[PDB]
Amino acid sequence: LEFLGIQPTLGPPNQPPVSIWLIVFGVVMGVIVVGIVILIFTGIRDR
Amino acid sequence: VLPNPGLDARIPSLAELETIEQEEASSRPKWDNKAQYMLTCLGFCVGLGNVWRFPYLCQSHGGGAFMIPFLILLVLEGIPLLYLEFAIGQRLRRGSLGVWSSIHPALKGLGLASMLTSFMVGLYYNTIISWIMWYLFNSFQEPLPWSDCPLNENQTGYVDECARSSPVDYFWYRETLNISTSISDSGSIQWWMLLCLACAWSVLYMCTIRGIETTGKAVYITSTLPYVVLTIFLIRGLTLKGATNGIVFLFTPNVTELAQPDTWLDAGAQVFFSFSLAFGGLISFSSYNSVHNNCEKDSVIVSIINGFTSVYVAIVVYSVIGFRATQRYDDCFSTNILTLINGFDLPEGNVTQENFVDMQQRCNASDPAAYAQLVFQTCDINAFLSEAVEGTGLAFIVFTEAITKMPLSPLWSVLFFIMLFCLGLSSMFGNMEGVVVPLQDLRVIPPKWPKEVLTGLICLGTFLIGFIFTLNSGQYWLSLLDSYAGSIPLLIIAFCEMFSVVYVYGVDRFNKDIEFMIGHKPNIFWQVTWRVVSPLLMLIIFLFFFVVEVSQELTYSIWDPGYEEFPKSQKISYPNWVYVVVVIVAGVPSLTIPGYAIYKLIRNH
Numbered sequence: 001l002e003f004l005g006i007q008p009t010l011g012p013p014n015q016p017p018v019s020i021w022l023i024v025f026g027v028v029m030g031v032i033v034v035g036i037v038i039l040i041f042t043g044i045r046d047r
Numbered sequence: 048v049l050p051n052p053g054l055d056a057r058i059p060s061l062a063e064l065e066t067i068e069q070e071e072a073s074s075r076p077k078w079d080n081k082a083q084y085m086l087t088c089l090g091f092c093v094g095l096g097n098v099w100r101f102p103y104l105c106q107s108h109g110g111g112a113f114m115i116p117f118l119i120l121l122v123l124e125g126i127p128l129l130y131l132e133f134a135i136g137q138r139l140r141r142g143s144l145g146v147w148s149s150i151h152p153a154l155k156g157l158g159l160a161s162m163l164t165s166f167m168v169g170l171y172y173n174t175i176i177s178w179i180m181w182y183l184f185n186s187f188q189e190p191l192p193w194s195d196c197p198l199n200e201n202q203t204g205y206v207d208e209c210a211r212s213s214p215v216d217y218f219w220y221r222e223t224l225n226i227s228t229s230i231s232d233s234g235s236i237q238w239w240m241l242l243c244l245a246c247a248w249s250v251l252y253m254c255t256i257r258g259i260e261t262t263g264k265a266v267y268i269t270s271t272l273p274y275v276v277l278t279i280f281l282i283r284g285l286t287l288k289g290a291t292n293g294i295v296f297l298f299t300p301n302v303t304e305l306a307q308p309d310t311w312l313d314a315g316a317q318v319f320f321s322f323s324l325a326f327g328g329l330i331s332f333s334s335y336n337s338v339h340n341n342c343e344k345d346s347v348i349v350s351i352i353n354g355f356t357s358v359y360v361a362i363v364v365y366s367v368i369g370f371r372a373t374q375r376y377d378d379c380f381s382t383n384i385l386t387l388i389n390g391f392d393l394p395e396g397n398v399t400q401e402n403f404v405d406m407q408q409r410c411n412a413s414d415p416a417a418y419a420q421l422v423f424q425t426c427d428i429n430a431f432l433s434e435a436v437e438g439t440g441l442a443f444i445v446f447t448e449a450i451t452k453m454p455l456s457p458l459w460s461v462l463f464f465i466m467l468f469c470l471g472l473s474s475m476f477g478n479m480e481g482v483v484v485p486l487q488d489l490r491v492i493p494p495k496w497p498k499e500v501l502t503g504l505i506c507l508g509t510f511l512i513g514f515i516f517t518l519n520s521g522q523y524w525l526s527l528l529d530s531y532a533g534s535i536p537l538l539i540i541a542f543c544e545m546f547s548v549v550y551v552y553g554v555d556r557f558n559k560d561i562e563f564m565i566g567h568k569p570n571i572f573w574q575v576t577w578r579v580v581s582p583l584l585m586l587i588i589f590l591f592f593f594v595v596e597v598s599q600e601l602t603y604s605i606w607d608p609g610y611e612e613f614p615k616s617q618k619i620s621y622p623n624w625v626y627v628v629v630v631i632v633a634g635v636p637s638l639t640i641p642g643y644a645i646y647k648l649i650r651n652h
């Protein structure tokens with residue numbers, strides 16, 4: 001239903017407020033550093 | 048006859064092998080089982096092959112017209128080279144540098160050449176993995192970021208760059224890459240890329256912290272995950288819209304393309320990447336097992352599975368391409384129908400796909416000189432299907448939008464990028480093992496110096512030198528590096544390996560030692576391939592590449608919003624100084640032979 005001279009303009013979306021990519025990177029890096037810490041501890045545990 | 052040209056009494060002798068095989072000496076890594084070694088070799092081969100290299104060339108040169116020469120050259124050259132590489136190891140019991148220095152120790156240059164080539168390949172790689180994981184991070188949400196354009200400051204219409212082009216090209220070239228108009232022009236560090244690259248390097252270093260003893264476990268799911276995901280893509284990629292539409296396009300050859308030999312030029316290079324030859328790699332994998340292993344069966348099964356996986360990935364890629372082309376053609380036809388209907392105010396349901404030409408003729412006959420105001424565009428299949436993307440657009444641009452059109456887009460997006468990440472990780476494992484091993488093999492490192500320290504130091508150094516790719520001109524530099532990395536160094540390394548095996552050492556002694564080690568003397572096929580088939584066939588393509596190096600032009604597509612016909616490719620040639628860069632890869636291998644000859648001639652007296 002178009003009026004040939006009147007077009008919609010109010011369509012602003014604001015879905016992501018926190019940039020989920022940042023939190024995903026953060027949890028991935030936390031897991032990575034935990035893994036490297038346990039790996040180096042086990043490697044140095046070669047007593 | 049005793050065909051030993053005065054090279055014995057210094058190589059690890061056969062009696063030395065008998066003495067070492069009956070007491071299992073320690074201080075040497077060994078695979079837990081033949082499966083952990085089969086699987087890691089398979090993962091390295093598939094990782095080097097089927098990411099950013101095989102599908103891109105398959106869809107760039109036409110498809111089918113490239114698969115046939117690739118298959119014939121693979122079955123003629125890769126199997127002999129793979130068997131030779133796998134059997135020269137497990138015999139001299141050393142790494143690539145050590146193996147090539149054990150016999151005829153005058154040169155030792157091919158080992159360091161392979162070291163440098165692997166280092167460069169890993170340098171330009173692991174940036175692809177950084178981009179893959181960055182695209183993976185932005186998943187896990189229903190409104191995928193590349194599906195929609197961002198609103199301008201006017202809050203009424205889209206941005207000009209995002210409107211003249213697609214949302215996906217904007218999310219890649221601008222939101223992620225932040226590419227520059229010029230090539231020499233640089234920018235900030237682009238902290239997103241720095242964070243992603245640091246994450247990639249950290250996960251790689253953690254995965255191979257202690258070397259083989261960890262990687263053998265790491266591959267157990269890393270070299271097997273991109274086989275259970277890919278298959279299901281088939282059951283999705285066939286029966287959605289393009290069943291026997293893109294696959295049929297792939298299956299029919301192209302006689303015109305085979306006439307142009309340029310495709311052949313790349314095809315050979317592909318097998319070097321497909322079978323992971325010319326690197327250190329498999330040698331360190333090969334010379335880590337017992338002396339009672341059947342190398343021929345290993346080579347044949349690896350080659351067969353590699354060919355099968357190549358066929359699989361080609362089928363899936365062209366399936367997605369055909370589905371996308373069909374969708375674009377359908378939407379263009381619908382736009383044409385809508386234009387006619389709005390022009391002449393016919394009932395909406397009267398014109399369809401098949402009754403369009405007759406109604407168009409009726410419309411112009413009825414009311415001439417008013418139809419002429421309409422702008423009609425033409426669209427037919429085999430015009431969208433023949434369109435080829437350059438660079439790394441195959442997925443970041445094609446597969447992303449094809450996924451968005453699909454119903455449950457985030458799920459297949461995340462699983463596809465996980466597959467890609469796993470393939471890249473297996474690849475990086477493979478060319479990482481070919482690094483440090485030569486460094487610890489040349490034996491100048493201080494004694495204690497635990498391997499973890501050396502791996503960390505090399506990882507941080509590679510991170511520092513790869514810092515460059517995180518700039519605003521990183522994509523251009525990566526394309527420039529890839530335009531010359533590979534091919535010629537790999538061809539030179541293969542020629543050196545073949546020459547050293549055939550002339551130095553000897554074919555006859557090779558037959559004797561393989562017969563004593565496991566038996567099953569190679570039949571005439573292998574002997575004729577190593578004698579005149581493989582070396583001559585590789586030398587002719589090397590010469591052909593050298594000849595056509597003079598006439599191929601030198602340019603690259605650029606992303607300049609401030610330029611007319613913006614959604615089109617622009618070529619601006621190359622700067623005058625960038626040529627100097629490629630010289631660093633020009634004459635690496637044969638530098639040390641004259642130096643050693645001079646040292647021998649002038650040092651004795």
Ligand SMILES: *[C@@H]1O[C@H](CO)[C@@H](O[C@@H]2O[C@H](CO)[C@@H](O)[C@H](O)[C@H]2NC(C)=O)[C@H](O)[C@H]1NC(C)=O
Nearest residue numbers: 108109112300301302303304305307429432433
């Ligand atoms: C088969 O391969 C040839 C090899 O290029 C294709 O040729 C290109 O076709 C496009 C559009 O017709 C032209 O712009 C180029 O000039 C052609 N290439 C050459 C040789 O210059 C041909 O279209 C392909 N046909 C298919 C896909 O079956």
Ligand SMILES: *[C@@H]1O[C@H](CO)[C@@H](O[C@@H]2O[C@H](CO)[C@@H](O)[C@H](O)[C@H]2NC(C)=O)[C@H](O)[C@H]1NC(C)=O
Nearest residue numbers: 407408409410411412414415416417418419423
């Ligand atoms: C619609 O009608 C136009 C008339 O303008 C068609 O064009 C002309 O067709 C005659 C052939 O009898 C040619 O000699 C002219 O050169 C054409 N152009 C003119 C007069 O400007 C036109 O072909 C029709 N549109 C379509 C379907 O193409």
Ligand SMILES: CCCNC(=O)COc1ccc(Br)c(C)c1
Nearest residue numbers: 097098099100102360439441442
């Ligand atoms: C990632 C940089 C270049 N882009 C590509 O290689 C994408 O092409 C591929 C590669 C592998 C696989 Br499986 C599939 C399904 C597609």
Ligand SMILES: *[C@@H]1O[C@H](CO)[C@@H](O)[C@H](O)[C@H]1NC(C)=O
Nearest residue numbers: 221222225233234235236519
């Ligand atoms: C990165 O992109 C934004 C716009 O999205 C732009 O303003 C900025 O200048 C870009 N970064 C650099 C160093 O140019």
Ligand SMILES: *[C@@H]1O[C@H](CO)[C@@H](O)[C@H](O)[C@H]1NC(C)=O
Nearest residue numbers: 393394396397398405406409
């Ligand atoms: C659809 O096209 C036909 C022939 O032009 C004509 O009857 C009319 O334009 C449409 N049909 C009906 C029932 O309206």
